[PDB]
Amino acid sequence: LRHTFVVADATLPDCPLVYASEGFYAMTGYGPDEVLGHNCRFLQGEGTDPKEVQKIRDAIKKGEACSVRLLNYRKDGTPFWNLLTVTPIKTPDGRVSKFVGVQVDVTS
């Protein structure tokens, strides 16, 4: 399964991405300069299902893992279907420190 992987910093209030695999930058068209420090939601656009988006929003607030199918757009504006799975990573005191995300392009 060809997949990409990113880390978001839950200690900052809008979960900015702090690490992305080589595949994430090659799949999306975006450089580190335009990804690090930003919330993953820039990948979204006109056809992205707000119902699915909201499922991720809620799981992140409730600190649960979650898995959704989103329509994302590359930097050149072409779309692709992104099967996204976000996992919360907690410290020993139960608090959420990072969210890790695996993304798979499932356009087949």
Ligand X SMILES: *[C@@]12=NC3=[C]C([C])=C([C])[C]=C3N([C][C]([O])[C]([O])[C]([O])[C]OP([O])([O])=O)C1=NC(=O)[N]C2=O
Q: Do 40 and 8 form a contact (C-beta atoms < 8 A)?
A: yes
- Tell me how long the chain is: 108
Residue for token pair 């992305």: 20
Cα separations in angstroms, 83 against 12, 29, 58, 77: 25, 17, 17, 18
Q: Which is nearer to ligand X, 74 or 92 (CB)?
A: 74
Please indicate if the annotation marks 44 as binding a ligand.
yes
Query: Cα(88)–Cα(74) distance, rounded to whole angstroms?
Result: 25
Encoded one letter per residue, x for contact with ligand X by CB under 6 A and - for no contact, window 2-41 reads ----x-x------x-----------------------xxx
Can residue 73 be called a binding residue for ligand X (CB under 6 A)?
no
Which of 57, 62, 90, 95 forms a contact with ligand X (CB under 6 A)? 57
Q: Which residues are annotated as a binding site for FMN?
A: 39-44, 57, 72, 82, 103
Q: Which residues are annotated as a binding site?
A: 39-44, 57, 72, 82, 103
